[PDB]
């Protein structure tokens, strides 16, 4: 629909997906979706199109007010979504809009109260780092968009590779794994009997802009360590040299495999194909 730009039904499916994520409590993905909707709006005062006026409630709703309601909800989500960096980010723009266009200083006060709570949360508590696995769909029984496709899954906080593997086995019949984990299988590039493979990949560290040298405390980075990421490397053992008994390093050569996906985790979906 985005391709076809028929935006109203686009929003309708957006809300569909939002419902889905709320069912799955994927507050992060839900917030991203709802944002993606709110991205359409403007801080202008005229409600330009009632297309954005959805069926949840339907009356005047200046673009401003609707956008404000959206931002409130999204901030709430991010809060209970345990990912406060974007929460503070958006609080900033919302406070700006308050101070510059509505001048409702009460909302300013409540919003900044929340932002202070956010900073407290960030510095105080710690958040587990979710493992990211790469999934290799091989075969032909896979649907069109799945066959011979490689995906990366933002796993849970401490999913072991095989836990997630089995969880995916639930998702699928013909639950088999090849063993040639690194390279593909040409026959199964065309053969039926869908073949799969799972393995953790390394979430390549992002660059927090303007942070490159200041003695910023770890918490910021450990957040950046796994969240807001797009690059993924995967190490590869290899023997290259004589297999001297006492020594393994005479042969150690690593064919680390890097992965760049389209969209940066986390996203509206808990996974993505490699790009």
């Amino acid at each position: 629909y985005k391709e076809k730009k028929r935006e109203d039904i686009y929003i309708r499916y957006l809300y569909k997906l939002r419902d889905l994520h709320r069912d799955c409590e994927n507050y992060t993905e839900a917030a991203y979706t709802l944002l993606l909707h709110a991205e359409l709006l403007q801080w202008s005062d005229k409600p330009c199109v009632p297309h954005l006026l959805q069926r949840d409630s339907y009356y005047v709703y200046t673009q401003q007010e609707l956008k404000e309601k959206l931002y409130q909800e999204i901030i709430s989500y991010f809060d209970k979504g345990k990912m406060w960096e974007k929460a503070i980010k958006l609080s900033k723009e919302l406070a700006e809009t308050y101070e510059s266009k509505v001048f409702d200083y009460e909302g300013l006060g409540n919003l900044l109260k929340k932002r202070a709570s956010f900073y407290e949360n960030i510095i105080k508590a710690m958040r587990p780092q979710p493992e990211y696995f790469a999934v290799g769909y091989y075969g032909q029984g896979f649907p069109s968009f799945l066959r011979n496709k490689i995906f990366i899954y933002r796993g849970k906080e401490y999913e072991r590779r095989e836990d997630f593997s089995l969880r995916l086995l639930t998702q699928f019949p013909n639950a088999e794994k090849m063993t040639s984990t690194t390279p593909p299988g040409e026959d199964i590039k065309s053969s039926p009997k869908q073949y799969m493979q799972c393995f953790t990949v390394k979430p390549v560290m992002s660059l927090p802009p303007s942070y490159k040298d200041k003695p910023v405390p770890e918490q910021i980075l450990n957040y950046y360590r796994a969240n807001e990421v797009q690059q993924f490397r995967y190490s590869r053992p290899f023997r290259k040299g004589e297999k001297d008994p006492d020594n393994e390093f005479a042969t150690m050569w690593i064919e680390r495999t890097t992965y760049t996906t389209a969209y940066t985790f986390p996203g509206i979906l808990k996974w993505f194909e490699v790009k």
Binding site: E131, Y158, E162, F199, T200, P237, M252
Partner: protein, 177 residues
């Protein structure tokens, strides 16, 4: 947030370090990377909350019996290990490892663990043992030794398959838990 101390001993002919590092790396079977240091660690969730832990990779040489016991004190659990396919490893454990360990820390839950489970029923390995007059010693007698100590659990796992490996570590953690 909490951490768990955990020791692993055993002869160097079984390479338990390979198993440990493979587990912590979450790596694919037969795909681990040997580091330069010992005493690996990880942070693991087994139930309710994630918990930290560290695995004392203790070299099994007879001489380091002076340094190894110094690591024993206040270790939450210890993991005695062996090779399921090495009768000599059995002799060492029942004769050296088990005795001196039970001597050193008589008050700590213990789990015995097998190794090379794939190699236990490996017909070529079995026939090599037979022609070398060694026994691909199976579970029930391992269970017997577990009863002998009354270890809180005994398990057999493998590195090339990681079968039960996750279960091995989970039982190890929930031994405290």
């Amino acid at each position: 947030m909490q951490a768990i101390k955990c020791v692993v001993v055993g002869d160097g002919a079984v390479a338990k370090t390979c198993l440990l590092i493979s587990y912590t790396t979450n790596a694919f079977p037969g795909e681990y990377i040997p580091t330069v240091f010992d005493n690996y660690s990880a942070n693991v969730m087994v139930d309710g909350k994630p918990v930290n832990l560290g695995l004392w990779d203790t070299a099994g040489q007879e001489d380091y019996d002076r340094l190894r016991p110094l690591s024993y004190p206040q270790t939450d659990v210890f993991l005695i290990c062996f090779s399921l396919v090495s009768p000599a490893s059995f002799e060492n454990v029942r004769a050296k490892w088990y005795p001196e360990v039970r001597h050193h820390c008589p008050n700590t839950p213990i789990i015995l663990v097998g190794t090379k489970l794939d190699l236990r029923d490996d017909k070529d390995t079995i026939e090599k043992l037979k022609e070398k007059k060694l026994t691909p010693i199976t579970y029930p007698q391992g269970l017997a030794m577990a009863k002998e100590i009354g270890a809180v659990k005994y398990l057999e796992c493998s590195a090339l398959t990681q079968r039960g490996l996750k279960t091995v570590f989970d039982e190890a953690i929930r031994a405290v838990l």
